[PDB]
Design a protein around this ligand. Sequence first.
Ligand code: MF8
Length: 387
Amino acid sequence: SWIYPTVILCLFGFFSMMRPSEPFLIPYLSGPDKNLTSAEITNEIFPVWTYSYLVLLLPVFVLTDYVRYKPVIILQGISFIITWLLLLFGQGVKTMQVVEFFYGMVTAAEVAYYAYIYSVVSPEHYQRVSGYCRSVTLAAYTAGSVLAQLLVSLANMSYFYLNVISLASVSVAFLFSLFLPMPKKSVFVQWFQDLKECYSSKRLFYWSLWWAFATAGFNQVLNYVQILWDYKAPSQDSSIYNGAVEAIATFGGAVAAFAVGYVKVNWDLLGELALVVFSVVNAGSLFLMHYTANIWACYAGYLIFKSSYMLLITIAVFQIAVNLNVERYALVFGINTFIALVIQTIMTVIVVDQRGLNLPVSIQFLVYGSYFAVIAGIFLMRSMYIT
Ligand SMILES: CN(C)C(=N)NC(=N)N
């Protein structure tokens, strides 16, 4: 019953996220293969990704539910092929901006990937499926990560062929997405009112509020944890270690996601308790990374933070899916992701941008830990009052 769509979507999300070039993305397109400058790379190529992500998330939650979640997934499969074909056979800054654009399309449609499996299975499985889905994606990343390192350490395989393997992987994901079962059929202000009825759930305007604010800080930590590690321990082994300490971290997240799916625990009443415990765990882990001048303890702190976040976000997605009581699975996921990315953009503007605070990475993770400490504090105080 639920097994067939779940296996196909897990295969799609595995082969679509098994990307060996993701770690060595910067070495690929800043070395002899492309000679993109580091000045033109993070100031002209990468910033296009956030804008494309925003302006393509705008249709994705408006129109994903109407199209029954498969054409957007298929659009991700095609955009995966186009993105890595353009990376693989593209030259110049203008081309990589288009690459970024298609990557933003890829992620805005990965939102639909997350919603689709809820669109096809009964709510009784919504827990299990949830973990499995997230797990496979994380697992895929870890696989790709380690595979990349292996292909750089035992085969001396260039970044070009890593991108070739990435294209081969995401092309198989397109074939798996072609086999996904089609879900069965279900002015401006009116639409807004519908949104009000969609978010009306007490435990879904709360879980969504956690989703909106937690993943922004999580993305920020993902982006600048490499910089934090480089600052804490300057060494010549960052290429084989840093990404390697984020390969197992992701693996931990995977297990954490697989923790939600496998075990049969009533999350409806442990949801608040688990939310507050793992949010204060995220805060303590982020403070652990900043305060200790030892990269071995900071690695464990990052692993704990990533695992607890992945478990919490799996719980959040599951609880939003079951308590939604409307078909708008991608509308809530899409709007949550869009608001989270808006918060991430605003806060990365204030804290790390030159025109803002321009805080170094020494205080950046103190700020991130304070921010998460604030999310944990709001949920902790709200839960304490209710009781
Ligand atoms: C160019 N590609 C494929 C990216 N992953 N880009 C990115 N902004 N990380």
